[PDB]
Structures are given as C-alpha cells and as structure tokens.
C-alpha cells in the first residue's frame, strides 16, 4: 500500500528523455500504492530541475506535486530526531537527510518498498523494523 520515492526516480519520471523514464512510469502508473514524497526530495528536485532544465519545467513539476496525486510527507521533530539517528548509524557513508528521512518514512508508512535508481547506495541501508528494503525498479 505504500512506496517511498527518491529524487532520482522523480527526475526519471517527469522527463521523457531520461533513459529510465519508461521503467519508472510502469512502476508509478499501475501502483495502487500511495506515492510518498519527502519535502527534502521536493527541495532537491526543485533545485535540480530548475538548474539543469529550467524554470518552466520547475513550475510544471511543482504544480504536479501540488496537484493532489502525491502524498506529501511531513517531517517534524520526531522524524528529524530519528533521521539523525539513521545518519549517525551510517555516518561514514555520508548518506544525508534525504536518504535518512526516506528510511524513517518507510517505517512511518509501514512499507519496505523504495523507488530509486540509486540501488546500491540504498541497499546498504536497513529498514528500522528489520528485514530488507525492496528497491524498484
């Protein structure tokens, strides 16, 4: 019922020209899981699309995100505290708050399913409830 979405996958999904666009499209469209996007990922996506593509696309992306199809997650005090613990656990890997927060949100939404193209990076991380993350595609 839930899928956590990294910046990479959204870059691939919103851009037809990206090599991975199709593979990601088939995962998102025909999901039935709710689509979870961290605000940290929104930040990253905003910056990246803006600088590498330009403002028109930035606007397109923001408006789609606010369009209602997406679950826009909240990261509050508890979430940042726990995220900090996850960064701490992995600190040598310098994984950053986007990834950390995605781990946390994976537990919040009771899902092990992660949508990202950085597979090897995320596969070294472990779910808070134990087990293994499921990375798609």
């Amino acid at each position: 019922s839930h899928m956590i979405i990294d910046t990479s996958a959204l870059l691939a999904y919103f851009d037809a020209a990206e090599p991975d666009h199709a593979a990601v499209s088939e995962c998102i469209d025909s999901s039935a899981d709710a689509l979870v996007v961290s605000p940290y990922v929104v930040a990253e996506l905003d910056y990246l699309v803006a600088t590498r593509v330009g403002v028109d696309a930035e606007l397109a992306v923001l408006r789609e995100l606010a369009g209602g199809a997406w679950e826009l997650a909240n990261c509050g005090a508890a979430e940042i505290e726990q995220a900090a613990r996850i960064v701490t656990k992995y600190q040598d890997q310098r994984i950053g708050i986007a990834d950390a927060a995605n781990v946390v949100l994976a537990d919040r939404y009771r899902t092990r399913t992660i949508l990202t193209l950085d597979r090897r990076h995320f596969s070294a991380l472990r779910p808070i409830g134990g087990g293994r993350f499921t990375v798609i595609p």
Partner: protein
C-alpha cells in the same frame, strides 16, 4: 492550524450528534467521514513525461546536486 468553521442547521446538528452517540465516535469524526465519503476516492492520477530534458541527470544526482542552495 486554522480549523474550518461549519454552520449547521439544528436539524443537521441534531443528526450529527445522534450519529456520533450511536457510533461511539466524535462529532468531528462523523463530519470528516461524511465529507470523505462524499468527495473522496476521486484523487487524480500522476502525470509523467512532463517535459523534454536534453542532458540526462537522473543517475547522476549526487554529482549534480553540487551547488545545492545556493
């Protein structure tokens, strides 16, 4: 944050109170579920393929997040 004001005719207020009392839930909750049952389940599908990129960045995120703000 800011809560929504709702003006209920007494007929309807009594009905909400009645439903809550029977269901062992809150009046607020009865109202919320009423609204969800009416306007929910209708949420729009996601739109992909939104634009034409040129340079592929999707697998390059770390590399290209460099100047992240700003």
């Amino acid at each position: 944050m800011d809560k929504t004001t709702v003006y209920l005719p007494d007929e309807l207020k009594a009905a909400v109170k009645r439903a809550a009392r029977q269901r062992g839930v809150s009046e607020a909750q009865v109202i919320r579920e009423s609204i969800r049952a009416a306007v929910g389940g209708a949420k729009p599908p996601p739109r992909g393929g939104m634009y034409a990129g040129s340079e592929p960045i999707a697998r390059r995120v770390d590399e290209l997040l460099a100047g992240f703000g700003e």
